[PDB]
Design a protein around this ligand. Structure first.
Ligand SMILES: Nc1nc2c(ncn2[C@@H]2O[C@H](COP(=O)(O)OP(=O)(O)OP(=O)(O)O)[C@@H](O)[C@H]2O)c(=O)[nH]1
Ligand SMILES: [Mg+2]
Length: 348
RNA sequence: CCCAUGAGGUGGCAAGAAAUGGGCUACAUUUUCUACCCCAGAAACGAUAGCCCUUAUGAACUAUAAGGGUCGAAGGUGGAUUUAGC
């Protein structure tokens, strides 16, 4: 049930649970969860994550990985309700313990859709602006990480419309504060710091890691429209174009991880979870090869271990449920689906 | 009536100072918007009326119907009573 070694893991004991620290919650990943599960763990008041077979296999990949090889690309995909993104957060935890520069985004659905104010950029042309989300992710990355910002030492300058500029040998904490102070050019600040991360090709001072959730939103059309009642293409958006031009496998110093999510998929049908189906033709042309990782449903013993975890937490107040017929009907109606399992144990 | 009270061809007639009836709309968050029709994300709504334009057929669109831009209120769940339903 419970595990005493949270950082290191093994295959021998599967379905185990390992506790984590509050500083690891608030510093490593304060954003990269669904708000449902965020509040769910807040109500837990006891942060314990479960081990997964594909998670351990991906960790084995990371353990057996050379950075002289090109930047490897991993894609997690489940059946719309598995633990793909939670295993991605587990990878984030492992790499943070490994002391790498991790940049993790909450979701790209929020980027491509639901912008309160879409703007002619001055740093470029033929490009809208995502200022609010830019500053949001900027302060998000600041909260995620500090010595890295202090020691980044950008070897290039950047002027600004605000009668100011930034010169060599300065830490990009100052551009982080720029974007947090004013949000208009925060999109340009983000699209510039992302390029600056790769501007250092050696990456000996740190090792770069990219973590993406809802990758399906990155490849696909937009719901936004132009004020003249005209559609908007995804590549026209500032952040979309920046990210697309940016993640290319050109830095070749580690790995990047992305996860699929159909719950927020737009212009796509229900009960569709195949990678090719989600990322489309343009996605396959963007990254023809990659490491697909199928995140299957819970195993039997892992399922019973999760039940025992809930019982130790006294999550199920229905005290006639801990019995053979109750468990049978429970996992029969659940079909080992983690999300509906969480829902059922929540409202039971 | 049967040089008409019959017959033929042009036009408009067919509006509301007003009262009432049947139906539609919404007066909210079980609501409104976005892809799917149900595990998501936001707002904290309401024009099938009017003005302008486009489209459907007609010989005839001032306006008949549908669509687009604007207008973005009344409205905050009903004054007796009363209607339909096993
Ligand atoms: N404790 C624990 N819960 C898990 C694990 N894997 C899946 N779950 C449960 O399953 C739910 C789904 O996990 P998510 O990764 O957030 O789901 P998702 O990948 O976003 O799925 P979609 O976005 O709908 O496509 C979680 O909220 C958990 O309740 C796990 O390894 N440990
Ligand atoms: Mg006509």
């Amino acid at each position: 049930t419970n595990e005493n070694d949270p950082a290191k893991h093994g295959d021998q004991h599967e379905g185990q649970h390992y506790n984590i620290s509050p500083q690891d919650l608030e510093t490593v990943f304060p954003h990269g969860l669904p708000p449902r599960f965020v509040m769910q763990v807040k109500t837990f008041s006891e942060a314990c994550l479960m081990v997964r077979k594909p998670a351990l296999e991906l960790l084995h990949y990371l353990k057996n990985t050379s950075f002289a090889y090109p930047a490897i690309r991993y894609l997690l995909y489940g059946e719309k309700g598995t633990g793909k993104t939670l295993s991605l957060c587990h990878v984030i935890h492992f790499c943070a313990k490994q002391d790498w520069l991790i940049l993790h985004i909450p979701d790209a659905h929020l980027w491509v859709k639901n912008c309160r104010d879409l703007l002619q950029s001055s740093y470029n042309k033929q490009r809208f602006d995502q200022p609010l989300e830019a500053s949001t992710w900027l302060k998000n990355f600041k909260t995620t990480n500090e010595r890295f910002l202090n020691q980044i030492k950008v070897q290039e300058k950047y002027v600004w419309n605000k009668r100011e500029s930034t010169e060599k040998g300065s830490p990009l904490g100052e551009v982080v504060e720029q974007g947090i102070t004013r949000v208009r050019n925060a999109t340009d600040a983000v699209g510039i710091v992302l390029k600056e991360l790769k501007r250092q090709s050696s990456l000996g001072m740190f090792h770069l890691l990219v973590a993406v959730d809802g990758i399906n939103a990155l490849w696909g059309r937009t719901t936004l429209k132009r004020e003249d009642k005209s559609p908007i293409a995804p590549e026209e958006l500032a952040l979309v174009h920046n990210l697309r031009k940016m993640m290319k496998n050109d830095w070749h110093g580690g790995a990047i991880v992305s996860a699929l999510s159909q719950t927020g998929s737009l212009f796509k049908p229900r009960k569709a979870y195949l990678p090719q189906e989600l990322l489309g033709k343009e996605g396959f042309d963007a990254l023809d090869p990659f490491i697909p990782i199928l995140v299957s449903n819970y195993n039997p013993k892992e399922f019973e271990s999760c039940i025992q975890y809930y019982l130790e937490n006294n999550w199920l107040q229905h005290e006639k449920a801990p019995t053979e017929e109750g468990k049978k009907e429970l996992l029969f109606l659940s079909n080992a689906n983690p999300s509906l399992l969480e829902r059922h144990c929540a409202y039971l």
